[PDB]
Design a protein around this ligand. Structure first.
Ligand SMILES: C[C@H](Oc1ccnc(-c2noc([C@@]3(C)CCCc4sc(N)c(C#N)c43)n2)n1)[C@@H]1CCC[N@H+]1C
Ligand SMILES: Nc1nc2c(ncn2[C@@H]2O[C@H](COP(=O)(O)OP(=O)(O)O)[C@@H](O)[C@H]2O)c(=O)[nH]1
Ligand SMILES: [Mg+2]
Length: 168
């Protein structure tokens, strides 16, 4: 049977979670997507020759620590933690997202990739070295992406699938 992988995209508002998800789903850059829409989207993709079914949860909206929201995020098997390379605050937020994922998954070994998005822009404020070093601190991959140009998009999502497989 076709394996389904439940992937969850997290990070500060405005970093490009929806744009990255849409690039994977539609193969199109969408510069405008209602910031409040949290939804999940499926697509069949061939990864290392194996057709699998990706179920992407593009998170959005208000920070809330109800049991219900915890259970919704706990359905994720792997997480993309996204910041934007021209937004220092979004990078400084990453550790909070990482903390909450560890808590809801009750594991210090959750499949996860650090994603530095908007790599097409010249306004960089987060050094690549600092991001690489944070991924090194957490023992996870770091992928540079652009939802605008498609840079790194498959690398980010497909790496997460490979991490889930290894974890299994
Ligand atoms: C960085 C923060 O801001 C926001 C803003 C929006 N969301 C968050 C946020 N943190 O974790 C999560 C997720 C979705 C991540 C996956 C696991 C779980 S489990 C659960 N219940 C979640 C929730 N809500 C989450 N989202 N944080 C700063 C710093 C603290 C105050 N705050 C202003
Ligand atoms: N240049 C550029 N803009 C991007 C990129 N990804 C998203 N954006 C823009 O960043 C803003 C927020 O994107 P959105 O997908 O709504 O982010 P979300 O709140 O994390 O879902 C919008 O103005 C998008 O056009 C990217 O890789 N490059
Ligand atoms: Mg969005």
């Amino acid at each position: 049977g076709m394996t389904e992988y439940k992937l969850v995209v997290v990070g500060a508002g405005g970093v490009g979670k929806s744009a990255l998800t849409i690039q994977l789903i539609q193969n199109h850059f969408v510069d405008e997507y209602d910031p409040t829409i949290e939804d999940s989207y499926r697509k069949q993709v061939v990864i290392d020759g194996e057709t699998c079914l990706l179920d992407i949860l593009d998170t959005a909206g208000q920070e809330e620590y109800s049991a219900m929201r915890d259970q919704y995020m706990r359905t994720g098997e792997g997480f993309l933690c996204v910041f934007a390379i021209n937004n220092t605050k979004s990078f400084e937020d990453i550790h909070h997202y990482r903390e909450q994922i560890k808590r809801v998954k009750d594991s210090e070994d959750v499949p996860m990739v650090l994603v530095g998005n908007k790599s097409d822009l010249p306004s960089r404020t987060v050094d690549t070295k600092q991001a690489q070093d944070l991924a090194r601190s957490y023992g996870i991959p770091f992928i540079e992406t652009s939802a605008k140009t498609r840079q790194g998009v498959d690398d980010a999502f497909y790496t997460l699938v490979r991490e889930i497989r290894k974890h299994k």
